[PDB]
Amino acid sequence: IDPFEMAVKQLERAAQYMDISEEALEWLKKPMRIVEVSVPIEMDDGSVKVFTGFRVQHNWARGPTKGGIRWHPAETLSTVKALATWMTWKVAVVDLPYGGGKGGIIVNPKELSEREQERLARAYIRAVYDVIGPWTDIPAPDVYTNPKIMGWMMDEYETIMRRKGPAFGVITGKPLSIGGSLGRGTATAQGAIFTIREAAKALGIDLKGKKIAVQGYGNAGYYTAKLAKEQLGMTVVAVSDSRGGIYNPDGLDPDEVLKWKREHGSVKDFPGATNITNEELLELEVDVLAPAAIEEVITEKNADNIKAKIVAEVANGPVTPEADDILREKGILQIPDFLCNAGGVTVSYFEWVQNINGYYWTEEEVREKLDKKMTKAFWEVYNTHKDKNIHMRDAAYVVAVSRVYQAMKDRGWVKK
Numbered sequence: 050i051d052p053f054e055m056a057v058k059q060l061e062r063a064a065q066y067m068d069i070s071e072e073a074l075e076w077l078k079k080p081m082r083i084v085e086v087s088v089p090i091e092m093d094d095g096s097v098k099v100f101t102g103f104r105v106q107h108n109w110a111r112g113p114t115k116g117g118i119r120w121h122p123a124e125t126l127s128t129v130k131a132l133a134t135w136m137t138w139k140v141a142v143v144d145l146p147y148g149g150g151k152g153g154i155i156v157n158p159k160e161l162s163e164r165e166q167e168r169l170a171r172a173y174i175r176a177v178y179d180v181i182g183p184w185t186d187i188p189a190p191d192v193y194t195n196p197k198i199m200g201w202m203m204d205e206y207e208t209i210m211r212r213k214g215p216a217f218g219v220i221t222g223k224p225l226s227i228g229g230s231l232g233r234g235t236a237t238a239q240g241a242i243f244t245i246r247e248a249a250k251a252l253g254i255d256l257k258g259k260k261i262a263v264q265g266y267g268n269a270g271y272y273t274a275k276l277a278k279e280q281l282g283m284t285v286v287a288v289s290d291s292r293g294g295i296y297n298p299d300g301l302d303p304d305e306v307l308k309w310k311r312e313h314g315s316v317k318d319f320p321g322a323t324n325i326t327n328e329e330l331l332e333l334e335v336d337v338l339a340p341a342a343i344e345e346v347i348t349e350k351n352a353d354n355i356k357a358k359i360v361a362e363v364a365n366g367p368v369t370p371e372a373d374d375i376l377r378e379k380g381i382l383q384i385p386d387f388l389c390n391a392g393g394v395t396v397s398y399f400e401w402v403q404n405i406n407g408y409y410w411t412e413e414e415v416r417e418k419l420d421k422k423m424t425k426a427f428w429e430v431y432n433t434h435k436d437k438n439i440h441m442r443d444a445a446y447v448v449a450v451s452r453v454y455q456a457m458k459d460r461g462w463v464k465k
């Protein structure tokens with residue numbers, strides 16, 4: 050419906066700037082496999098309740114599909130399909146041997162007990178086994194899911210398969226004790242920091258002690274701020290929660306800010322920092338801007354007021370296309386959404402490789418591989434930007450669609 054057609058429109062707009070056949074557009078619009086199943090679980094009161102689960106594999110030309118699992122009561126088939134379609138290009142931009150996947154269950158996990166959550170995960174695996182697997186489809190943790198549900202799902206898959214193949218490789222995000230990989234928690238933030246550093250290098254800006262402003266102080270935002278201040282040595286000047294933001298021109302320490310937020314429930318009234326609104330934080334005179342909160346954070350109203358030279362949107366599509374055009378005409382380099390949060394999927398791919406090979410890498414090795422892959426992806430996007438004279442979002446979309454088209458043409462799926 051709405052999200053699926055929005056993704057289709059985005060794909061059309063992307064193809065407007067590159068040469069691919071019409072049959073390729075039609076093949077890419079329709080996801081290859083849609084699996085809608087009924088997931089029954091014996092509730093704690095003794096009754097049996099059935100939920101609706103969706104597994105959407107949009108494409109697998111480049112390799113086994115990869116996709117997160119969402120447990121949200123508002124989840125719909127169109128949303129899962131659109132997210133799988135986006136995940137296709139998310140894994141394509143990084144140049145991974147992955148296709149686009151997505152999973153979801155129509156359920157609210159707030160009132161589900163731990164036994165009920167375990168039963169839900171195991172029954173979902175029992176229902177979707179026939180269309181998943183280490184070489185076929187790799188589920189991942191996503192919103193309202195944590196590595197414990199991943200452990201339960203992996204255990205169920207291993208039990209059903211009778212331990213014939215690499216069970217640990219069927220899914221990602223598993224705990225470090227069982228098939229885990231290092232750097233998973235800070236994966237998205239680490240990729241974002243690498244992209245920020247690379248954009249600064251491309252623009253000729255050294256980031257020694259300069260201004261970075263993060264709008265949104267969740268796990269991803271806190272990790273991004275801490276990693277920036279540590280590796281890049283930049284001056285974190287503003288962080289905001291769902292309530293308000295705190296600004297200090299001298300700098301901030303993300304550790305103490307997170308401690309204060311945990312203790313008081315918010316970052317409001319932080320010592321040495323003036324309380325400011327989210328819109329004021331978005332319009333600060335900084336060099337790097339990273340929105341880590343609710344999407345559509347920047348619109349036409351405030352796009353013209355943005356002065357940060359580098360905008361790394363870690364959030365999923367937090368900037369409207371009109372605001373994208375406004376930032377483009379303002380001389381602002383804006384890192385696309387799936388070119389920023391791609392660190393999570395890159396480290397998930399690393400975890401999958403570790404699971405298959407039976408060899409687990411150290412923190413430094415995972416960091417090095419993530420750096421290489423993410424820098425190469427961003428540099429390819431920036432080169433296409435400077436070549437085709439098209440937006441960063443447009444360049445990343447063109448690269449991803451070109452890779453998918455080449456994979457499909459090599460497989461013989463499309464003759465032209």
Ligand SMILES: NC(=O)c1ccc[n+]([C@@H]2O[C@H](COP(=O)([O-])OP(=O)(O)OC[C@H]3O[C@@H](n4cnc5c(N)ncnc54)[C@H](OP(=O)(O)O)[C@@H]3O)[C@@H](O)[C@H]2O)c1
Pocket residue numbers: 117189190191192193194237264265266267268269270289290291292314315341342343393394
């Ligand atoms: N490709 C992938 O594998 C993939 C895809 C999607 C998501 N993910 C990751 O997996 C996670 C799943 O999403 P999620 O929605 O479960 O995470 P989440 O809700 O974003 O985690 C914390 C969020 O809740 C808000 N928050 C923080 N402290 C709070 C408090 N005391 N009271 C109320 N709200 C508070 C924060 O908003 P403010 O920042 O505004 O304070 C923050 O954005 C995300 O964190 C994301 O990084 C991965």
